[PDB]
Each structure stands twice: as structure tokens, then as C-alpha cells.
């Protein structure tokens, strides 16, 4: 567990942390430990941050995962939900409702710009997708972001 | 190896006249030493027909401590006859479905279970016990509980099973877990049934209930060319077919559904499929909705419901109406999945004709707002089942794409080459006619 914390703290490098996190997971169900719980979302987090969010339904319906349903594998879901469906706004949704969950978890801090970031490039390709001339005002209505952020980040898009 | 067939036809009509005197104790300790001698001789025949004395002997006593004791004690002797103990359990199974009290009856069937746990001899008795305890439960009231002893067993492995009861397992075990609600695990145990099954000598009345559970399954989130396809199923079937209602409503089903589905190359060949057939004329006004929307022109919701709006949803005396637009939400859902493909359709027919259009113009055409003809096409866009990009200042939607000088010089040559087939078909009618006509 501690070796996935470090290695996913700033390596950049997801594949061996969610393996290592599988590992203790694997390792505290075992002993029918308590913090099996945080051993999962670590490595749901793991999988939203590795960009496959189609995985986590996998994850958490895993023969092993079943007992552990429950808020923070709610929490993560609806996270890795908002991901797929490419929703800012749901994952500002998922943040307001799970704060206890996502917001008190010291790594899941520490990731939640990163994921922030990501989630706010994907949104405003899916929303400009269907569009050549498209107004930057609009952008920013559809987006529910500040015209002059909307447009700073797409400027660093196109750079 | 020593028969001992003489000595237990003597012995046993014995040992049942002081059974019914109420010699119970020494006739089992007698029937229990023949039966060691019987099982050290190896003699199957013997060894069973002791088994089934005994059982039947203990049970016509109310004696049902006793019973589940012998019951248990036979089944764990050393060396036991595995034909022996089938032939008991059978038995016994024949008398749990004559006892009547609840937990006797629980008591009884749960002491055969532990016996028949895991013996390839003894499985179908097993399963059977395992259906009948279930439907206990069930009756009891309750449905998880149910569900889950159902699903603990695996049907599609028992090898000495008939396919006919192991496709009833699995029907029961889908609508068990349906009843739970339990969708993932529904579709699971579904995937075991063999379609091709249903064509043999009989299979009907199965085909029909595990088509219906099919269609439920489906319909719960929304799987329309799937649902079509089982009321197709359903709609083939020669029971349904014999009686003019049902096959008057799986078509209506059917043709529902099909106009439902999302467009796509199966969705259009079985809409062609649909319309080709001449048992539609007796269902004119779903003829109707089919062939417009199997035609390439521009079709009005308003139109739509003006038409055929009471008939697809409220029906007729003479058509009775279907649950596929009831008042039900489910009802509320499908009628704006209907109206979005509605929508869909006049956008693909006026992308086939049309190279620029005006927002205002396909939100006009549309009977929508702006606002929300632009979220339809971009949807539309975003999920790639059309081609459209919005030019928002201008607002002009086009719909052709990008031509490459390649792509212009290939159509160039196309042209061409066309063009000299042409020559050579009009050359070979030219020189036909001269033959024709002119060697008189």
C-alpha cells in the first residue's frame, strides 16, 4: 500500500501503482482487514487516473469487491461515471456531494487538480466538437466556466 | 459376488410385519446387520432394496428423528452402493413431495441436500430438491433468498439431465433473478440457453417464456433491435401463429420496435425484412408508420400524432393497443424515444439532400427550437452517426465534407471510365438494332 502511495505520489507512472495497490488489496481482504476500503478506491483512483474509467464498473462488481460496496465505492463510481461521460459539471457534482469521501482523503487531494485539468480539456473538445466557428462566449455558457479561463485554456490547447 | 437375493425376499416381508406390529428398533438393527452383510457381499440389488425398506418402513411411523438419522447413517456407511443410496434418495424425494407440513418438509429436504451434496449418482435429485425449496421460499415469501439458492446451482453441466430440464432450470432461475432484480446476473444465466434448442419437437411453451424473460431483460434499459428480434422469435413460433391475436400483437410488437431502434445496417435490413411480408395488410395503420419511416422524405410529429396518435397508444376495439406506448413511464419513455427517431430520421433525409442549410431553417423543419436542434445535431455529431459541422456565426450547418484534390480527380476518373462503359453499351444496342433491321 505504501510503496502504490509513493509511486503514484508524483512518478507519473499509474500501471505499476494500481498493480501495487491491487496487491494490498488483495493482501488486507486476506485478513478481512478494514482498510481493504481504501486499498480499492486507491486503485479505482488509479484507473480514472490511467484514463479507463470503463474499468472501475469491473473493478467494483469483482467476485473479491462486493462485500466493500458501500459510500466510497459510490463515490468513486459516480467519479469514473463523470469522467466517461466527459461532465465537468458532474464531477464538480460528485466532489459537492462525496466531500467527505474525496476531499478528506489526503492522495485523492493531492490528484484532484490533475483530474480537474484532464476532465476540463475532454470537456471542451466534446463541447467544440460539433463546431467551426463556434463562439468563445458560447464555449464558456455550455462549459459553466469564465469566458477568460475558457479561452486562456484553449489558447494552451492549441499551443 | 454371494447373491443374496433368496435370503432378503424371505427376510423382508418379515421385517415389515413387525415394522407395522411396532417392532421398529429391532426390525432396523436387523435390517442393518443384512445390510452391512449385503454391502461387504457387494450385492447392489440387495443392498438397495434393504435401503428402500428401511426408508419406507421409518416412514410410515411418523418417526421423523428417526428418519433423518437412518436417512444420514446409510448415507455415510462405509462403502455404500452409490445405485443404493440413489435409489433411497429417490425414494425419499417421493416422499417430501407427499408431506405436507412446512418445517418438516424444510427439515426432511434440507438433510437430503447435505446427503446429496456434490455426487454425480445423485444430482438430479439434488436439483430437484433445490427447485422445490426455492419455490418453498418463494410461496413463503422470500425472493432473494429464493433467487439465490436457485442461482448456487449449475444446470448447464449435469450431463444425465434432459436438455428439457435444463432449459426449465435456467427459465426459472432468469425469472428468479429478474424478481430480485438482478440484471447483470440475469443476462449471465441467459447466455446458457442454446436457441437452436427451440426448433426441436416441443419446445414452445419454453421458447415462448424464455423469449418473454428476453424481452423484459432487454427492455429495462433499452435494447430495442434486440426486443424486435425476440418478438420475431416469438411472432415464428406455430402456437402463436395459429391464433390471429397473438400473431396480430407480436407483429405490432414488432414493427414497433423495429421503427424504435436506432438507425443503423441491421436496423435497416430488418425494417426491409418487416415490410416484406404480406401478413402486414391485416395491421394497415402500422404498415403505414413502417413505410414512412422506411421512406426518404421529411415526416411532421405533429403529422405523426395527428395520424396514427390514438391508434399506437390508446388503440381500438377492433385493434387492441399494445404496452409499447402505454400510460406507464415506461410508456412516457418510449413515446420521446419515438419522437428523438423522428427527429433523427428528418436529420439524416435532409443531410442526404442538402449541402448547406440555415439553423433557423432545420430548427423550422425540425418543429424545434433552435437551442435544441442544435444540441440534437450536435449529439448527433459527438456520437458519429452523422456528419455535420455548425459554423455558429454564420449559423449554416454543413454536411459535406472536405473534398481533397485527389478526391476530385478520383471522381474526375470515375466519371471517365463510366462514361466509356456507357459508349461500349450504347455500341452494342446501336449494332443489335442494325442487325435487326437491316438485312430485310
Known amino acids: 500500500m505504501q510503496s502504490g502511495i509513493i509511486h503514484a505520489a508524483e512518478e507519473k507512472d499509474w500501471k505499476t501503482a494500481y498493480s501495487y495497490f491491487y496487491e494490498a488489496f488483495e493482501g488486507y481482504d486476506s485478513i478481512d482487514s478494514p482498510k481493504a476500503i481504501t486499498s480499492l478506491k486507491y486503485m479505482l483512483l488509479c484507473k480514472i487516473m490511467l484514463n479507463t474509467p470503463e474499468d472501475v464498473q469491473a473493478l467494483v462488481s469483482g467476485k473479491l469487491a462486493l462485500r466493500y460496496a458501500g459510500r466510497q465505492t459510490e463515490a468513486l463510481k459516480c467519479v469514473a461515471q463523470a469522467s466517461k461521460n466527459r461532465s465537468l459539471a458532474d464531477f464538480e457534482k460528485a466532489l459537492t456531494d462525496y466531500r467527505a469521501e474525496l476531499r478528506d482523503d489526503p492522495i485523492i487531494s493531492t490528484h484532484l487538480a490533475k483530474l480537474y485539468d484532464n476532465l476540463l480539456e475532454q470537456n471542451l473538445i466534446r463541447v467544440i466538437e460539433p463546431f467551426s466557428r463556434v463562439q468563445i462566449e458560447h464555449i464558456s455558457s455550455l462549459i459553466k466556466l469564465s469566458k477568460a479561463d475558457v479561452e486562456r485554456k484553449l489558447s494552451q490547447m492549441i499551443l | ?440
Request: proline share 2%; with cysteine; aromatic share 6%.
Open chain 2, 1 to 440: 459376488e454371494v447373491d443374496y437375493s433368496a435370503t432378503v425376499d424371505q427376510r423382508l416381508p418379515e421385517c415389515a410385519k413387525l415394522a407395522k406390529e411396532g417392532r421398529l428398533q429391532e426390525v432396523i438393527e436387523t435390517l442393518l446387520s443384512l445390510e452391512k452383510q449385503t454391502r461387504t457381499a457387494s450385492d447392489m440389488v440387495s443392498t438397495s432394496r434393504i435401503l428402500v425398506a428401511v426408508v419406507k418402513m421409518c416412514y410410515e411411523a411418523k418417526e421423523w428423528d428417526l428418519l433423518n438419522e437412518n436417512i444420514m447413517l446409510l448415507s455415510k456407511r462405509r462403502s455404500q452402493l452409490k445405485q443404493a443410496v440413489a435409489k433411497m434418495v429417490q425414494q425419499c424425494c417421493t416422499y417430501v413431495e407427499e408431506i405436507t407440513d412446512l418445517p418438516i418438509k424444510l427439515r426432511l429436504i434440507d438433510t437430503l441436500r447435505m446427503v446429496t451434496e456434490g455426487k454425480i449418482y445423485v444430482e438430479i435429485e439434488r436439483a430437484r430438491l433445490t427447485k422445490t425449496l426455492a419455490t418453498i421460499k418463494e410461496q413463503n415469501g422470500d425472493v432473494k433468498e429464493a433467487a439465490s439458492i436457485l442461482q448456487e446451482l449449475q444446470v448447464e453441466t449435469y450431463g444425465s439431465m434432459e436438455k428439457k430440464e435444463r432449459v426449465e432450470f435456467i427459465l426459472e432461475q432468469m425469472r428468479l433473478c429478474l424478481a430480485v432484480k438482478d440484471y447483470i446476473r440475469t443476462q449471465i444465466i441467459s447466455k446458457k440457453i442454446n436457441t437452436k434448442f427451440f426448433q426441436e419437437e416441443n419446445t414452445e411453451k419454453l421458447k415462448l417464456k424464455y423469449y418473454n424473460l428476453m424481452i423484459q431483460l432487454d427492455q429495462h434499459e433499452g435494447s430495442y433491435l434486440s426486443i424486435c428480434k425476440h418478438y420475431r422469435a416469438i411472432y415464428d413460433t406455430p402456437c402463436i401463429q395459429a391464433e390471429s391475436e397473438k400473431w396480430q400483437q407480436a407483429l405490432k410488437s414488432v414493427v414497433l420496435y423495429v421503427i424504435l431502434a436506432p438507425f443503423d445496417n441491421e436496423q435497416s435490413d430488418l425494417v426491409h425484412r418487416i415490410s416484406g411480408d404480406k401478413k402486414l395488410e391485416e395491421i394497415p395503420k402500422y404498415k403505414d408508420l413502417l413505410k414512412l419511416f422506411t421512406t426518404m422524405e421529411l415526416m411532421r410529429w405533429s403529422t405523426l400524432v395527428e395520424d396514427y396518435g390514438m391508434e399506437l397508444r390508446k388503440g381500438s376495439l377492433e385493434s387492441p393497443a399494445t404496452d409499447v406506448f402505454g400510460s406507464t413511464e415506461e410508456g412516457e419513455k418510449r413515446w420521446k424515444d419515438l419522437k428523438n427517431r423522428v427527429v433523427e430520421h428528418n436529420i439524416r433525409i435532409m443531410a442526404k439532400y442538402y449541402t448547406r442549410i440555415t439553423m433557423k431553417r432545420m430548427a423550422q423543419l425540425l418543429d424545434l427550437s433552435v437551442d435544441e436542434s442544435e444540441a440534437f445535431l450536435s449529439n448527433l455529431v459527438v456520437n458519429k452517426t452523422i456528419f455535420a459541422k455548425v459554423d455558429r456565426l454564420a449559423g449554416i450547418i454543413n454536411f459535406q465534407r472536405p473534398k481533397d484534390p485527389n478526391n476530385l480527380l478520383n471522381d474526375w476518373s470515375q466519371k471517365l471510365n463510366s462514361l466509356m462503359s456507357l459508349v461500349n453499351k450504347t455500341t452494342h444496342l446501336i449494332a443489335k438494332e442494325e442487325m435487326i433491321h437491316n438485312l430485310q
